[PDB]
Design a protein around this ligand. Structure first.
Ligand SMILES: [Zn+2]
Ligand SMILES: [Zn+2]
Ligand SMILES: [Zn+2]
Ligand SMILES: [Zn+2]
Lengths: 270, 270, 69, 252, 47
DNA sequence: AACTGGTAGAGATTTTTCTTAGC
DNA sequence: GCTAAGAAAAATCTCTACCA
DNA sequence: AACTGGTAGAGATTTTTCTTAGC
DNA sequence: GCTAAGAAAAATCTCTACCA
């Protein structure tokens, strides 16, 4: 058999730290045993899993960061779902300037979700007081993981390239920062719908407001309740609201949850 | 028309530095004119071309590099076509130690091509004298481009991971370096043919020698010269050697160059 | 006399339209972008450029070749 | 096919060939040829190295010679203690596959460092060619001494001239081609032995012609696309696949 | 670029009234801008 | 127990549009 | 009068550096 | 005028192999 | 005696960090 092969492969991995294919070809043991022998070693197991996440893209979510340029401190805030950039220059990296900039941004545009890193200025009592008064959900990323707020770092790269492009037309650096914001916002097209940033954020917020008013005026005068049968057992659930009657399936709302049920397992009561 | 649009787009790109889609949508000019307007700007044009090269993989080509670990200077030489690692520890980063290591490597294995970077020790009179005496073609990479010798940097990463895996079984660092060389060479399988590094370099050099002797003994007793017709004009070329007669095409050798010619445009003379 | 001038202008126009390219390259320790140069040889992976009567070898990943219409 | 197998059996009965010559001539697969060779009652090292220490011009040289081809690897030591000998043995075991070391009864060869290196590298150490190779190497060193400044440069150049320039033997090959060909032949033998065991872990029930009964369990040798080679009654035969049932055998 | 070619094509059509394919083959501009140059002339007609 | 990489540009390859010769 | 070869022009896909 | 990114591992998805119920 | 459902085991494809 190969039981002495299993014992000798355990001692040989204890000494040499082979991979599983070398033991499975030298000692003629099956591959599952060699993979388990490799998997039960703590000196091994140094590798990720090779996958990427997907950040939030709600229509009222902003991300914020701070960067350095020519010894100055720039602060960048980006609306995520369209790519809308606001930027300022701070005299220092304290918490009062970040709280004042966040208050100005919350006074200009509707903000309901803010995403930041674990810096010393974003986690402060002044920023917490501004978030409490303006009712903003403040969330932080994982420490030492800059890929969480990837949008604002990409916008840092774009803003620095534009600043290096139009540097020779201004004297100070603050004027060049504001001109780079204008050039990025209204003079660069291409993307989702062929829009710039300002047309895209206008379209997103206007479509959100119009579809909320339209679905309220539709759903306030509805009828035709639907009793449906789903689950691993053939049970019956209570009163659900019919949303759309389609050729093949229907859309039901139950407990403020939307589901798609085929037409064989549902009955409509007027 | 759009000629005033072309002039206004030239002034607007002179001021704002738009991309081509913004001008082609605002001023209603065709896209080739907007692309040429963008292409004639020196403040723009900051981008690569997004492609990768392919390094040499001849069966007698070696790459060399030097790295640091625990305040010591390791030197790594890698046979490219199989992945065969030799490594040593130097007392200093001068030229005499690199020349002595290159002489030992040239005395052990057949070396006909060496690839290095532009370091201060690889470009020296001692290394030039060793390369002249051992008849080695020494080539350098582009400065500040570490992707040229990518194989030896990848092998630096593998050797450092193995050194961190088996560090607690040795006292000094030189013994751990030699044990990591042994573990990488003979205790890790997987790759092209399921071999390790030593079996692959043995197979490569043995197959090279055997196929040279076999094709010499085949080609020394040949016949059946072939006159063929190729080119943009229907001309006729001189005496060429027939290599293999295949169903659909033939292989000819002309002026020590190999070509594949279909059977319609060739005639064989015994 | 005039016909030979016509054939000479044909050949000179073709010769002038073969290989009049510009190359913007990126080199140095701090990878900055530099001005235009003339392309001499273009193989797969790298190019050879002449700038200021100096020959440099730059990979194709760090250069942009602007052609002519 | 079967005519080729019977011709190979008669040829091995007459002349006692090897399996490579029969597999090349009679056009049979190599597992059947190795089976025919292994079934003969009358027909039944590439990894051994020798070590030596010598003195030359106030320095201590250590020479390791592969015996089966004559392959010299030399180095210059600063002293003659056990730790540098163990370090040179570890480098030699890191570059080439070593499984049997042959030394003399020196002091620095009998040490805890050399014992720990042989234990970690799993090398059989045996205390008892090399004098002839030392004579040839020292004549080459005295031949090209004037072209080098130090002694180590002349040592490495003499190793290069001995390995890749001096040609001799039957076919007129150097030492590097001989050691590479010998190790490649050993690699081919080990791979074919692994394939032989993995195929021979089966069993075949075969059914003869003009009979509806299954016969005894014959051992599988080579499973083809249309033919199946089996061993039964100390005899090899070829049965088509439509009269066979291949089952797994748990017969340890 | 061919922007100076477009300016020279405007001057040359203002003097000699060329057609579109002739200017597109001489001054090496694309055919759309040459056809538009011929189209803007009140005396000429693209044919 | 409730967290996450993305943006813009350079070429290569496929598709649509426009002018003109042949029947 | 109608169809199709052929060339230009626009739309789409794949791949890379940089921001921390 | 002659230069260039690559290696190994973790999961997901497809394919081959083995045991056993039904006719 | 023969076929096929079903589950385990091996082979193949796609994607990422690190070396400078
Ligand atoms: Zn392990
Ligand atoms: Zn520009
Ligand atoms: Zn025999
Ligand atoms: Zn006109």
């Amino acid at each position: 058999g190969f039981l002495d092969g299993i014992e000798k492969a355990q001692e040989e991995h204890e000494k040499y730290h082979n991979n599983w294919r070398a033991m499975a070809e030298d000692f003629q043991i099956p591959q599952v045993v060699a993979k388990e022998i490799v998997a039960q070693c703590p000196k091994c197991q140094v590798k990720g899993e090779a996958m990427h996440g997907q950040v939030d893209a709600s229509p009222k979510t902003w991300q914020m960061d701070c960067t350095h340029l020519e010894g100055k401190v720039i602060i960048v805030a980006v609306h995520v779902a369209s790519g809308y950039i606001e930027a300022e220059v701070l005299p220092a990296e304290t918490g009062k300037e970040t709280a004042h900039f966040l208050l100005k941004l919350a006074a200009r545009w509707p903000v309901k979700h803010l995403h930041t890193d674990n810096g010393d200025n974003f986690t402060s009592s002044a920023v917490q007081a501004v978030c409490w008064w303006a009712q903003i959900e403040h969330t932080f990323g994982v420490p030492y993981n800059p890929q969480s707020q990837g949008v604002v770092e990409s916008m840092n790269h774009q803003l620095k390239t534009i600043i290096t492009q139009i540097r020779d037309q201004a004297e100070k650096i603050e004027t060049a920062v504001q001109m780079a914001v204008l050039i990025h916002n209204f003079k660069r097209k291409g993307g989702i719908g062929g829009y710039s940033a300002g047309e895209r954020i206008i379209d997103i917020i206007a479509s959100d407001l119009q579809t909320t008013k339209l679905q309220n005026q539709i759903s306030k005068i509805q009828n035709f309740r639907v009793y449906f049968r789903e689950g691993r057992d053939q049970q019956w659930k209570g009163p659900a609201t019919l949303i759309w009657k389609g050729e093949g399936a229907v859309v039901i709302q139950d407990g403020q949850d939307l589901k798609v049920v085929p037409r064989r397992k549902c009955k409509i009561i007027k």
